[PDB]
Structure formats: C-alpha cells, structure tokens
C-alpha cells in the first residue's frame, strides 16, 4: 500500500468527518466492516469509542491474571483467568478454559 499518507496530515476536514461519524448512523459502517472481515478476525461485540472506553482500573472491574467464573454461555460455570484486555470492545480474553 504505497500512499505516503503516514508522513503528512492532509485532508484534515475529510478525515475528521470520517472519524466523527454520527452515533445514530454507526450501524451503517458496522455492517460493512463486519461483513468484510473473516470469521477468525471478527468479534461479536460492538466496538466502542474513547468517551466510553474503560481507561482506569476502577472501570475495569477485573485485571488480567485473576481467576473468574463464566456464566450465561456455553462455558457456564467454568473457572478461568482473564489473559488480557481487548481495548476494542471493553471486554476480556480468558485462557483456554474460557
């Protein structure tokens, strides 16, 4: 992908318009993004923005490396250790037991 775009900030107005999409039209872009990515790439959770992402430990009720129980799912009742954050859907990623 030869663009040189990583060296200059051109089209600031257009970039801001694309990056500040109205919240009520988000499903429009969500649809194409989801249907244009492979199954092993995509996740079933809604991507979040800065104003609602968990940026502090108090917001993240759990921190990677602590045991937890999973319920309301196929692995209901399984005990696993959250291996890391997601930073994209405000979610956790567990170990193989999850």
């Amino acid at each position: 992908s030869g663009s040189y775009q990583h060296l200059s900030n051109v089209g600031s107005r257009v970039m801001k318009r694309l990056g500040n999409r109205p919240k009520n039209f988000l499903p429009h872009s969500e649809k194409f993004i989801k249907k244009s990515t492979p199954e092993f790439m995509k996740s079933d959770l809604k991507e979040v923005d800065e104003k609602t992402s968990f940026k502090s430990e108090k917001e993240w009720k759990f921190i990677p490396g602590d045991r937890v129980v999973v319920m309301s799912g196929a692995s209901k009742g399984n005990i696993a250790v959250i291996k890391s954050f997601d930073k994209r859907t405000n979610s956790f990623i567990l170990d193989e037991n999850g």
Partner: peptide, 15 residues
C-alpha cells in the same frame, strides 16, 4: 484480539 492471542502463543511456544 486474534493478533495478540497469536503473538503470545508464538512467544509461549518459543519459551
């Protein structure tokens, strides 16, 4: 993400 999981699994295998 899958990227991070794959990376850490590569590192785990190397360890």
């Amino acid at each position: 993400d899958f990227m991070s999981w794959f990376k850490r699994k590569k590192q785990e295998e190397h360890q």
